[PDB]
Amino acid sequence: SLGIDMNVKESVLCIRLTGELDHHTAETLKQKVTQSLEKDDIRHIVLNLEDLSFMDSSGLGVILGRYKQIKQIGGEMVVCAISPAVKRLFDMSGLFKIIRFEQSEQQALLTLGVAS
C-alpha cells in the first residue's frame, strides 16, 4: 500500500508520502504534476517519505521529470528522506545535483531554503 499527505507553508506544499515508490505509487505524484503545473501563484515543494521501502527507478523519473516541471512554474524542487541504500539511485545516476537531496536535516531547507 501507499499513503499520501499534503501541507502548505508560506507557499511550500509538503507532500508526505508513505508506502512504496514505484510506477504505481509514482503515479500519484504524476497527477500532482498537472495540479502543480498551474496551481495559481508560485508555491514551493517539500517532499519527505518516511516509509521508504522499495523505491526503485520507477518514480525516479517521475521525480526528475518534475524537477524541471516544478521549476517551470517558477519555484524550486526539493526532496528528502534519503538513505544509505536509497541515495544509491541518484548516486549512480550522477544527476543528484539535479535532484538536490539531503537527510531529514533538510526538513528546514526542504521548505525550499527560502521561507522563514
JSON list of C-alpha atoms in Angstrom, two decimals:
[
{"chain": "A", "resi": 1, "resn": "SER", "atom": "CA", "xyz": [0.00, 0.00, 0.00]},
{"chain": "A", "resi": 2, "resn": "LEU", "atom": "CA", "xyz": [0.93, 3.66, -0.18]},
{"chain": "A", "resi": 3, "resn": "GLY", "atom": "CA", "xyz": [-0.11, 6.78, 1.70]},
{"chain": "A", "resi": 4, "resn": "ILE", "atom": "CA", "xyz": [-0.15, 10.47, 0.85]},
{"chain": "A", "resi": 5, "resn": "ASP", "atom": "CA", "xyz": [-0.02, 13.76, 2.71]},
{"chain": "A", "resi": 6, "resn": "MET", "atom": "CA", "xyz": [-0.05, 17.43, 1.78]},
{"chain": "A", "resi": 7, "resn": "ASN", "atom": "CA", "xyz": [0.88, 20.55, 3.71]},
{"chain": "A", "resi": 8, "resn": "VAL", "atom": "CA", "xyz": [1.40, 24.23, 3.00]},
{"chain": "A", "resi": 9, "resn": "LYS", "atom": "CA", "xyz": [3.96, 26.61, 4.46]},
{"chain": "A", "resi": 10, "resn": "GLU", "atom": "CA", "xyz": [4.19, 30.19, 3.27]},
{"chain": "A", "resi": 11, "resn": "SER", "atom": "CA", "xyz": [3.75, 28.61, -0.14]},
{"chain": "A", "resi": 12, "resn": "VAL", "atom": "CA", "xyz": [5.54, 25.29, 0.22]},
{"chain": "A", "resi": 13, "resn": "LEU", "atom": "CA", "xyz": [3.22, 22.31, -0.02]},
{"chain": "A", "resi": 14, "resn": "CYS", "atom": "CA", "xyz": [4.78, 19.47, 1.93]},
{"chain": "A", "resi": 15, "resn": "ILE", "atom": "CA", "xyz": [3.94, 16.07, 0.48]},
{"chain": "A", "resi": 16, "resn": "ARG", "atom": "CA", "xyz": [4.28, 13.24, 2.98]},
{"chain": "A", "resi": 17, "resn": "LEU", "atom": "CA", "xyz": [4.36, 10.01, 1.02]},
{"chain": "A", "resi": 18, "resn": "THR", "atom": "CA", "xyz": [4.22, 6.76, 2.94]},
{"chain": "A", "resi": 19, "resn": "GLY", "atom": "CA", "xyz": [4.34, 3.41, 1.19]},
{"chain": "A", "resi": 20, "resn": "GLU", "atom": "CA", "xyz": [6.27, 2.35, -1.89]},
{"chain": "A", "resi": 21, "resn": "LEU", "atom": "CA", "xyz": [7.99, 4.22, -4.70]},
{"chain": "A", "resi": 22, "resn": "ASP", "atom": "CA", "xyz": [7.06, 2.55, -7.97]},
{"chain": "A", "resi": 23, "resn": "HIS", "atom": "CA", "xyz": [5.35, 3.38, -11.24]},
{"chain": "A", "resi": 24, "resn": "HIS", "atom": "CA", "xyz": [2.28, 2.60, -9.17]},
{"chain": "A", "resi": 25, "resn": "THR", "atom": "CA", "xyz": [2.99, 4.96, -6.30]},
{"chain": "A", "resi": 26, "resn": "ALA", "atom": "CA", "xyz": [4.90, 7.29, -8.58]},
{"chain": "A", "resi": 27, "resn": "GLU", "atom": "CA", "xyz": [1.62, 7.75, -10.43]},
{"chain": "A", "resi": 28, "resn": "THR", "atom": "CA", "xyz": [0.03, 9.54, -7.50]},
{"chain": "A", "resi": 29, "resn": "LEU", "atom": "CA", "xyz": [2.69, 12.21, -7.89]},
{"chain": "A", "resi": 30, "resn": "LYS", "atom": "CA", "xyz": [2.13, 12.06, -11.63]},
{"chain": "A", "resi": 31, "resn": "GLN", "atom": "CA", "xyz": [-1.27, 13.63, -11.08]},
{"chain": "A", "resi": 32, "resn": "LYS", "atom": "CA", "xyz": [0.22, 16.02, -8.56]},
{"chain": "A", "resi": 33, "resn": "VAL", "atom": "CA", "xyz": [2.19, 17.32, -11.53]},
{"chain": "A", "resi": 34, "resn": "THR", "atom": "CA", "xyz": [-0.75, 18.54, -13.58]},
{"chain": "A", "resi": 35, "resn": "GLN", "atom": "CA", "xyz": [-2.12, 20.18, -10.46]},
{"chain": "A", "resi": 36, "resn": "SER", "atom": "CA", "xyz": [1.23, 21.79, -9.73]},
{"chain": "A", "resi": 37, "resn": "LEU", "atom": "CA", "xyz": [1.61, 22.55, -13.42]},
{"chain": "A", "resi": 38, "resn": "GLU", "atom": "CA", "xyz": [-0.54, 25.57, -12.65]},
{"chain": "A", "resi": 39, "resn": "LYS", "atom": "CA", "xyz": [-1.77, 25.78, -9.07]},
{"chain": "A", "resi": 40, "resn": "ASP", "atom": "CA", "xyz": [-2.07, 29.55, -9.17]},
{"chain": "A", "resi": 41, "resn": "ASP", "atom": "CA", "xyz": [0.68, 31.73, -7.76]},
{"chain": "A", "resi": 42, "resn": "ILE", "atom": "CA", "xyz": [4.12, 30.32, -7.01]},
{"chain": "A", "resi": 43, "resn": "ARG", "atom": "CA", "xyz": [4.15, 27.77, -4.21]},
{"chain": "A", "resi": 44, "resn": "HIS", "atom": "CA", "xyz": [7.00, 25.55, -3.09]},
{"chain": "A", "resi": 45, "resn": "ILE", "atom": "CA", "xyz": [7.65, 21.82, -2.93]},
{"chain": "A", "resi": 46, "resn": "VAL", "atom": "CA", "xyz": [8.63, 19.79, 0.11]},
{"chain": "A", "resi": 47, "resn": "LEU", "atom": "CA", "xyz": [8.84, 16.03, -0.34]},
{"chain": "A", "resi": 48, "resn": "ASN", "atom": "CA", "xyz": [9.61, 13.70, 2.54]},
{"chain": "A", "resi": 49, "resn": "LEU", "atom": "CA", "xyz": [8.98, 9.97, 2.62]},
{"chain": "A", "resi": 50, "resn": "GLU", "atom": "CA", "xyz": [9.30, 8.25, 5.98]},
{"chain": "A", "resi": 51, "resn": "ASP", "atom": "CA", "xyz": [8.09, 4.91, 4.68]},
{"chain": "A", "resi": 52, "resn": "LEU", "atom": "CA", "xyz": [10.84, 4.17, 2.19]},
{"chain": "A", "resi": 53, "resn": "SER", "atom": "CA", "xyz": [10.89, 0.52, 1.19]},
{"chain": "A", "resi": 54, "resn": "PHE", "atom": "CA", "xyz": [11.02, -0.49, -2.46]},
{"chain": "A", "resi": 55, "resn": "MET", "atom": "CA", "xyz": [11.63, 2.87, -4.09]},
{"chain": "A", "resi": 56, "resn": "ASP", "atom": "CA", "xyz": [13.01, 1.90, -7.48]},
{"chain": "A", "resi": 57, "resn": "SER", "atom": "CA", "xyz": [13.73, 3.80, -10.68]},
{"chain": "A", "resi": 58, "resn": "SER", "atom": "CA", "xyz": [10.02, 3.80, -11.43]},
{"chain": "A", "resi": 59, "resn": "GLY", "atom": "CA", "xyz": [9.31, 7.13, -9.78]},
{"chain": "A", "resi": 60, "resn": "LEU", "atom": "CA", "xyz": [12.91, 8.26, -10.12]},
{"chain": "A", "resi": 61, "resn": "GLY", "atom": "CA", "xyz": [11.92, 9.86, -13.40]},
{"chain": "A", "resi": 62, "resn": "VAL", "atom": "CA", "xyz": [8.54, 10.92, -12.06]},
{"chain": "A", "resi": 63, "resn": "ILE", "atom": "CA", "xyz": [10.52, 13.00, -9.60]},
{"chain": "A", "resi": 64, "resn": "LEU", "atom": "CA", "xyz": [13.22, 14.06, -12.02]},
{"chain": "A", "resi": 65, "resn": "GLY", "atom": "CA", "xyz": [10.66, 14.95, -14.66]},
{"chain": "A", "resi": 66, "resn": "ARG", "atom": "CA", "xyz": [9.05, 17.15, -12.04]},
{"chain": "A", "resi": 67, "resn": "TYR", "atom": "CA", "xyz": [12.24, 18.90, -11.00]},
{"chain": "A", "resi": 68, "resn": "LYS", "atom": "CA", "xyz": [12.23, 20.62, -14.37]},
{"chain": "A", "resi": 69, "resn": "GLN", "atom": "CA", "xyz": [8.46, 20.82, -14.20]},
{"chain": "A", "resi": 70, "resn": "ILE", "atom": "CA", "xyz": [8.33, 22.34, -10.74]},
{"chain": "A", "resi": 71, "resn": "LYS", "atom": "CA", "xyz": [10.87, 24.95, -11.76]},
{"chain": "A", "resi": 72, "resn": "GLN", "atom": "CA", "xyz": [8.78, 25.55, -14.86]},
{"chain": "A", "resi": 73, "resn": "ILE", "atom": "CA", "xyz": [6.25, 27.17, -12.55]},
{"chain": "A", "resi": 74, "resn": "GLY", "atom": "CA", "xyz": [8.83, 29.48, -11.01]},
{"chain": "A", "resi": 75, "resn": "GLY", "atom": "CA", "xyz": [10.00, 27.84, -7.80]},
{"chain": "A", "resi": 76, "resn": "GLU", "atom": "CA", "xyz": [12.36, 25.07, -6.76]},
{"chain": "A", "resi": 77, "resn": "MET", "atom": "CA", "xyz": [12.48, 21.30, -6.39]},
{"chain": "A", "resi": 78, "resn": "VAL", "atom": "CA", "xyz": [13.24, 19.77, -3.02]},
{"chain": "A", "resi": 79, "resn": "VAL", "atom": "CA", "xyz": [13.29, 16.18, -1.84]},
{"chain": "A", "resi": 80, "resn": "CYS", "atom": "CA", "xyz": [14.43, 14.46, 1.34]},
{"chain": "A", "resi": 81, "resn": "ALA", "atom": "CA", "xyz": [14.03, 11.12, 3.06]},
{"chain": "A", "resi": 82, "resn": "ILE", "atom": "CA", "xyz": [17.20, 9.64, 1.62]},
{"chain": "A", "resi": 83, "resn": "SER", "atom": "CA", "xyz": [19.08, 6.60, 2.86]},
{"chain": "A", "resi": 84, "resn": "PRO", "atom": "CA", "xyz": [22.41, 4.74, 2.73]},
{"chain": "A", "resi": 85, "resn": "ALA", "atom": "CA", "xyz": [20.69, 2.21, 0.49]},
{"chain": "A", "resi": 86, "resn": "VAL", "atom": "CA", "xyz": [18.42, 4.57, -1.41]},
{"chain": "A", "resi": 87, "resn": "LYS", "atom": "CA", "xyz": [20.61, 7.52, -2.32]},
{"chain": "A", "resi": 88, "resn": "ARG", "atom": "CA", "xyz": [22.45, 5.00, -4.46]},
{"chain": "A", "resi": 89, "resn": "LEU", "atom": "CA", "xyz": [19.77, 5.55, -7.07]},
{"chain": "A", "resi": 90, "resn": "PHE", "atom": "CA", "xyz": [20.82, 9.16, -7.58]},
{"chain": "A", "resi": 91, "resn": "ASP", "atom": "CA", "xyz": [24.39, 8.45, -6.56]},
{"chain": "A", "resi": 92, "resn": "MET", "atom": "CA", "xyz": [24.73, 6.19, -9.57]},
{"chain": "A", "resi": 93, "resn": "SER", "atom": "CA", "xyz": [22.79, 8.50, -11.87]},
{"chain": "A", "resi": 94, "resn": "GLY", "atom": "CA", "xyz": [25.19, 11.32, -11.10]},
{"chain": "A", "resi": 95, "resn": "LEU", "atom": "CA", "xyz": [22.32, 13.73, -11.60]},
{"chain": "A", "resi": 96, "resn": "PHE", "atom": "CA", "xyz": [21.77, 14.01, -7.87]},
{"chain": "A", "resi": 97, "resn": "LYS", "atom": "CA", "xyz": [22.68, 17.66, -8.30]},
{"chain": "A", "resi": 98, "resn": "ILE", "atom": "CA", "xyz": [19.53, 17.88, -10.40]},
{"chain": "A", "resi": 99, "resn": "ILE", "atom": "CA", "xyz": [17.64, 16.31, -7.52]},
{"chain": "A", "resi": 100, "resn": "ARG", "atom": "CA", "xyz": [19.49, 18.14, -4.76]},
{"chain": "A", "resi": 101, "resn": "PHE", "atom": "CA", "xyz": [18.80, 15.75, -1.91]},
{"chain": "A", "resi": 102, "resn": "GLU", "atom": "CA", "xyz": [19.56, 15.87, 1.80]},
{"chain": "A", "resi": 103, "resn": "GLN", "atom": "CA", "xyz": [18.89, 13.97, 5.00]},
{"chain": "A", "resi": 104, "resn": "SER", "atom": "CA", "xyz": [15.89, 14.94, 7.10]},
{"chain": "A", "resi": 105, "resn": "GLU", "atom": "CA", "xyz": [18.04, 17.74, 8.47]},
{"chain": "A", "resi": 106, "resn": "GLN", "atom": "CA", "xyz": [16.90, 19.44, 5.29]},
{"chain": "A", "resi": 107, "resn": "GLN", "atom": "CA", "xyz": [13.50, 19.50, 6.95]},
{"chain": "A", "resi": 108, "resn": "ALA", "atom": "CA", "xyz": [14.27, 23.20, 7.17]},
{"chain": "A", "resi": 109, "resn": "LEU", "atom": "CA", "xyz": [15.98, 23.71, 3.83]},
{"chain": "A", "resi": 110, "resn": "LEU", "atom": "CA", "xyz": [13.28, 21.43, 2.48]},
{"chain": "A", "resi": 111, "resn": "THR", "atom": "CA", "xyz": [10.92, 24.39, 2.68]},
{"chain": "A", "resi": 112, "resn": "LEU", "atom": "CA", "xyz": [12.98, 25.47, -0.31]},
{"chain": "A", "resi": 113, "resn": "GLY", "atom": "CA", "xyz": [15.61, 27.15, 1.83]},
{"chain": "A", "resi": 114, "resn": "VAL", "atom": "CA", "xyz": [13.59, 30.29, 1.20]},
{"chain": "A", "resi": 115, "resn": "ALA", "atom": "CA", "xyz": [10.78, 30.95, 3.63]},
{"chain": "A", "resi": 116, "resn": "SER", "atom": "CA", "xyz": [11.41, 31.66, 7.30]}
]
